[PDB]
Write a protein that binds this ligand. Structure first.
Ligand SMILES: C[C@@H](O)[C@H](N)C(=O)OCCCCCn1cnc2cc(Br)c(Cl)cc2c1=O
Ligand SMILES: C[C@@H](O)[C@H](N)C(=O)OCCCCCn1cnc2cc(Br)c(Cl)cc2c1=O
Ligand SMILES: [Zn+2]
Ligand SMILES: [Zn+2]
Lengths: 401, 401
């Protein structure tokens, strides 16, 4: 009883309909979760020293032919036309990132250049294969590309791996299985490029004490991949993360920089995504938590409620203070029994229920109950606000005990 | 200068390519401005009680055919096909918002329902008419649709008008022309509906003490509208804001709610955008400010710089303090003359240059230079940080004096 489709309906997070197969409509509360997940990713982009960009939604087929995506992916790409030119709605963000890199002369002092995007991508998947948020047609990839020198590969691949485990640990995912996918039958780049790339990814895994198995022939057409699979609380495997080494795309798109030796050089490209897609990861989280999202992700974090209208002015004031502390809060001043109110907000998976009777109004206190049924007692309002702020800002998995 | 296309190149904000006509490649610094503009709009969504949602990029042509917009605008829509079905890449967000409205039984108690989206839209505009950020194919509107009763229209229009002036004032736009477009020759609804609807728009304007003029017969087939034209510092007119009444779309897309008398009732829709295209608005702002973006919008708010090698670690400490204070800060530790650093960052329109010589280090102070060439002298570090935070939080047009 943790279906993301059911929870998504019950908590008014999102919906899907037949007029847009495999594409999500995010309702207010679901979009709040999505945006908080974006805020989290951005905090990591800042920490790990990434730029953030935005590329065009479509680009001319001629460009996708040049990069190799047309030859490999044409049947799974959406196309559209204008003025006798054909455009592919983008399946990937990498070519756009190279286009941005190519604006303005680059040198070795600009490298490593780490370029991230919340990339809106589309895949023309067979419609019968779509399911929930887990297999979709339109998605938002937490993508980035690192442009670096050959000598910087080791440190930059190492940083990507650190970033992967760091981010998964935030959500409580500690059981991770790793595969290394090597040269596929249909590919671009020379065998010596592939020897180098496969070797570098293998060394990274050895050095980080990450056990792995090879997945022979399952690499991307443009480079080998480290694939990260996390396991949820039901012990189900979800492949989410990927780190790839690419010596082909930057050459094909005429990317270059001036090295230390003043010689014109082609940058190496590292591709990576960690969550995989915002939509699928939200799906996974919804099931992992069964809708009991950690406080930092919860659509509504606190509900403050009165017993009678005698405490209404105090509740409104307290609601305002919580909102000023950055907390997603609402007041429940209805003329309903306290057990009726508490149940409604517990059903809605609100982390904290703040109750104000006469005794609380008199003492400048608030009675705190958690959605798990724990009565924390009557506590000083400022102590409660501070404790909630820390729980939220630290992105704690745990509520107050 | 005040050419946003030249400034856009100079400050590394964005670029365009023929591979994606009229679709912007946002570089890090331009995307920072875009993201800050979103944050600003979201603060107003909160203040004016809007939900925020997100819809997919495409929906079945079959659904678009039902809206009453198909015959009018089929030539300007991008289409793409899959499995014998044709999809439209959305040029507007209204039908998607109605799809969200149509999920779950709605009651009169849910009205007015205010639904905003930063809606990623595409129009197949002729390539010859494209121009920088102002005339594009891919654009993002600060869009919203309000679903309400007939009796609620005036108050809801009143709030939209307040929102327009509130938002324009933030950017220094106080000269605003207002036009009310009245019933066209070809229209839906009775004459009485139009009498009431035109009167609601006029009364809402009167209630905000706003003089206006008519654009006779220029209303849409589905209702009258108000349009807001702001004037920049060169006295150039930019039509940006729209409040559009719509008595057609809800019925066309089977939208309804349970009235207080238990009757199935069709809501009225209000379409509204304040900035309009955010790409275009960024273009307007770029020219308005001549690239001197107010500090809250500036891609890089502060550069901290040393005179000689001796102050490098003080610069690092101060940069970290600014980082921790939420300021977009960079350290310039190059072995270059201080005047060279000031010239470069002045040219890049960085609001503040925080200069650290021995005297500053020794006193725990910093010397503050503005991009206007103003020497503000030696100031206490914590005081400067507090003043910068206040300038940013208040979204002030004015730098410290
Ligand atoms: C991490 C990113 O930078 C990287 N480009 C990426 O997407 O890699 C994901 C794993 C390797 C690549 C695996 N794959 C393969 N065929 C595809 C065809 C289409 Br059409 C689309 Cl939309 C996506 C893919 C895809 O993802
Ligand atoms: C404010 C928004 O909700 C509103 N829908 C909107 O876009 O308003 C902007 C101004 C008036 C919008 C009026 N118009 C203008 N150009 C269009 C181009 C295409 Br292609 C299509 Cl399908 C429809 C329209 C359209 O209806
Ligand atoms: Zn990639
Ligand atoms: Zn609309």
């Amino acid at each position: 009883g943790r279906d993301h489709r059911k929870i998504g309906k019950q908590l008014d997070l999102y919906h899907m309909q037949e007029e847009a197969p495999g594409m999500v409509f995010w309702h207010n509360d679901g979009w709040t979760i999505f945006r908080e997940l974006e805020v989290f990713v951005r905090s990591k982009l800042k920490e790990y020293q990434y730029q953030e960009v935005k590329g065009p939604f479509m680009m001319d087929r001629v460009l996708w032919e040049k990069t190799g995506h047309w030859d490999n992916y044409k049947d799974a790409m959406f196309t559209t036309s204008s003025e006798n030119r054909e455009y592919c709605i983008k399946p990937m963000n990498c070519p756009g990132h190279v286009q941005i890199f190519n604006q303005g002369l680059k040198s070795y002092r600009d490298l490593p250049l780490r370029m991230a995007e919340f990339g809106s991508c589309h895949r023309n998947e067979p419609s019968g294969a779509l399911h929930g948020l887990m297999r979709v047609r339109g998605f938002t990839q937490d993508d980035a590309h690192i442009f670096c020198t050959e000598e910087q590969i080791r440190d930059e691949v190492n940083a990507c791996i650190r970033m992967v485990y760091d981010m998964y640990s935030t959500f409580g995912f500690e059981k991770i299985v790793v595969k290394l996918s090597t040269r596929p039958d249909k590919r671009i780049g020379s065998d010596e490029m592939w020897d180098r790339a496969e070797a570098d990814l293998a060394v990274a895994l050895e050095e980080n004490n990450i056990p792995f198995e090879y997945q022979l022939g399952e690499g991307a057409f443009y480079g080998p991949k480290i694939e990260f699979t996390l396991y949820d609380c039901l012990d189900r495997a979800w492949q989410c993360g990927t780190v790839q080494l690419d010596f082909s795309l930057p050459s094909r798109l005429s990317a270059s920089y001036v090295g230390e030796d003043n010689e014109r050089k082609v940058p190496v490209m590292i591709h990576r995504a960690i969550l995989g897609s915002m939509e699928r990861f939200i799906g996974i989280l919804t099931e992992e938590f069964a809708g009991f999202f950690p406080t930092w992700l919860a659509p509504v974090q606190v509900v403050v409620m009165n017993i009678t209208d005698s405490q209404s002015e105090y509740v409104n004031e307290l609601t305002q203070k919580l909102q000023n502390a950055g907390i997603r809060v609402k007041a429940d001043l209805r003329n309903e029994k306290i057990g009726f109110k508490i149940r409604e907000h517990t059903l809605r998976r609100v982390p904290y229920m703040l109750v104000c009777g006469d005794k609380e109004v008199e003492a400048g206190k608030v009675a705190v109950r958690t959605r798990r049924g724990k009565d924390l007692g009557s506590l000083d309002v400022n102590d409660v606000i501070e404790k909630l702020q820390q729980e939220i800002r630290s992105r704690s998995l745990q509520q107050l005990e």
